[PDB]
C-alpha cells in the first residue's frame, strides 16, 4: 500500500513547487510520522522533513512540510538546480512497519542550451590483435538531453553493430551519452574512413577516424 505521490513535478528557478503524499487512515491519517527524503543519483536518501513539519538541522527553510487529512505535502520554495532529485515521503504504520511513497522526480528547468562535445576513438591495436574492433563515440556537456547518432563508412551509413546509451546527467548538470560500433578487423581495415555524426537541436557535430 505504497503512499501515492505524483510521478513527476517540474519547476523553474526561484519558483515554488508542492509534492503531495496521500496515504490511508492507517499510516498518514494515523501518525504525525510523515518524513520526506531527498535522493540524488547514486546516493543514500537524505532526511529533509520529519514529523510532518520538522526540519532536521542543516536543512534550509526553503523546505517545509504540512499535512491535512490523509495527505502530506512537501513544498520547496526558491527552486534551485541542486533541488533536482527524487523525493519520497514515508510514514510509520504501526507495529514496526514503515511504508514509503511511490516517489516523485523533480526536474528544474532553465539551464542554457549546451552543444555536445564529441570524442571518437578508433579500435586499439590490442583489440585488433584480439580479432575484435570497437569504435567509441563519446558525447558530453550537452543540453537538452536528446541526441541522435549516425555512423558512416566512407560516407555510406552503418546500422549493424551500433549500441548507444540513453543520455544522463553528469556532475556538471549537463548530459552525456556513448555510442559503440562493433566491427570485424577486416571491415575496419577495408575502409578509408569511419565517421560518428551527432545531431543535437538541428546541428550536427561529426568526427572521423581511419586505420
Amino acid at each position: 500500500s505504497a503512499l501515492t505521490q505524483p510521478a513527476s513535478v517540474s519547476g523553474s528557478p526561484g519558483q515554488s513547487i508542492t509534492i503531495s503524499c496521500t496515504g490511508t487512515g492507517s499510516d498518514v491519517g494515523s501518525y504525525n510520522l510523515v518524513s520526506w527524503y531527498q535522493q540524488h543519483p547514486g546516493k543514500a536518501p537524505k532526511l529533509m522533513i520529519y514529523g510532518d513539519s520538522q526540519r532536521p538541522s542543516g536543512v534550509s527553510n526553503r523546505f517545509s512540510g504540512s499535512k491535512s487529512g490523509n495527505t502530506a505535502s512537501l513544498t520547496i520554495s526558491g527552486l534551485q538546480a541542486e533541488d533536482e532529485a527524487d523525493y519520497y515521503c514515508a510514514s510509520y504504520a504501526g507495529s514496526g512497519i514503515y511504508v514509503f511513497g511511490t516517489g516523485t522526480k523533480v526536474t528544474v528547468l532553465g539551464q542554457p542550451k549546451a552543444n555536445p562535445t564529441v570524442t571518437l576513438f578508433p579500435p586499439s591495436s590490442e583489440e585488433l590483435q584480439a580479432n575484435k574492433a570497437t569504435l567509441v563515440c563519446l558525447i558530453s556537456d550537452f543540453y537538452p538531453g536528446a541526441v541522435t547518432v549516425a555512423w558512416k563508412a566512407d560516407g555510406s551509413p552503418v546500422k549493424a553493430g551500433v549500441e548507444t546509451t540513453k543520455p544522463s546527467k553528469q556532475s556538471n548538470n549537463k548530459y552525456a551519452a556513448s555510442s559503440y560500433l562493433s566491427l570485424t578487423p577486416e571491415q575496419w581495415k577495408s575502409h578509408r574512413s569511419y565517421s560518428c555524426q551527432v545531431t543535437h537541436e538541428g546541428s550536427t557535430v561529426e568526427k572521423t577516424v581511419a586505420p
Partner: protein
C-alpha cells in the same frame, strides 16, 4: 559521528542465499531499533524489515516474509539480514538504517544482484590520444572497459592521483546482456611526452583489478 557500513551484497543465482551485515559505530547501538530498506535499480524505496533495540519485535514486509530473517548482535555492534530463496525481483541496493525520531542515518548500501547469468570480468583496451605532443591544445585519452557483468566497475587514473579532467561515462547495456563503458581524461597535449597515464579498472563481482597503460599511438 554515526557510521553504518553494509557488506555482503553480490551476485547470486535465483533460489540462492546471501547474508548482509551492517557494522555500526558512533552511537550506542544497543538502544536503537534498526531496519533494512532496499531500492531496485531505477525504482523507489521499499521498506524491508525492522528489529527492536534488544533483538525482539522483528517485522517484515510481506514481499519478504518467510524468506528473510533480521537479527543483530549488540556485543559486536552489527545488524544482519539473512536472505533465502532469492529471486530476480530482490535485485536492489540494500540500505541499513537507524530507526529514530528526529534523525535518519543510512549506510551507503550494498548491491545485491539475483540473476541466472554468471559474472564476467571485463577486457580493458587503451584509447590512445590522436593529438600528438607538438600539436598543442588538449588531448583526450581513455580506457575502454568491455563486456562485463554485473555492474558496477570503477575506473581511476594513476592509482587515484589523477582526478582532474577525468570523466567515466555511464555503461551501455549491450544486447548480449553484457556491459561496456569508457573512461576519458583530457590533459595538455604537451604533457604526452613526459607524463605516464595508467587507468586502474576495478570490477569487484569478478575480483578483476586491471592497470592499463595508455600511450601515444
Amino acid at each position: 559521528e554515526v557510521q553504518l557500513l553494509e557488506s555482503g551484497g553480490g551476485l547470486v543465482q535465483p533460489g540462492g542465499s546471501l547474508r548482509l551485515s551492517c557494522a555500526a559505530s558512533g552511537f550506542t547501538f544497543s538502544e536503537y531499533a534498526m531496519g533494512w530498506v532496499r531500492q531496485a535499480p531505477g525504482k523507489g524505496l521499499e521498506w524491508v524489515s525492522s528489529i527492536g533495540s534488544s533483538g525482539g519485535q522483528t517485522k517484515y514486509a510481506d514481499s519478504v516474509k518467510g524468506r528473510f530473517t533480521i537479527s543483530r548482535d549488540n556485543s559486536k555492534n552489527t545488524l544482519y539480514l539473512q536472505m533465502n530463496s532469492l529471486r530476480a525481483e530482490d535485485t536492489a541496493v540494500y540500505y541499513c538504517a537507524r530507526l529514530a525520531i528526529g534523525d535518519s542515518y543510512w549506510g551507503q548500501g550494498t548491491m545485491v544482484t539475483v540473476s541466472s547469468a554468471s559474472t564476467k570480468g571485463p577486457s580493458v583496451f587503451p584509447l590512445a590520444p590522436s593529438s600528438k605532443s607538438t600539436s598543442g591544445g588538449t588531448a583526450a585519452l581513455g580506457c575502454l572497459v568491455k563486456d562485463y557483468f554485473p555492474e558496477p566497475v570503477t575506473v581511476s587514473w594513476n592509482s587515484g592521483a589523477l582526478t582532474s579532467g577525468v570523466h567515466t561515462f555511464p555503461a551501455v547495456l549491450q544486447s548480449s546482456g553484457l556491459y561496456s563503458l569508457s573512461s576519458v581524461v583530457t590533459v595538455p597535449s604537451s604533457s604526452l611526452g613526459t607524463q605516464t597515464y595508467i587507468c586502474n579498472v576495478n570490477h569487484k563481482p569478478s575480483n578483476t583489478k586491471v592497470d592499463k597503460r595508455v600511450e601515444p599511438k
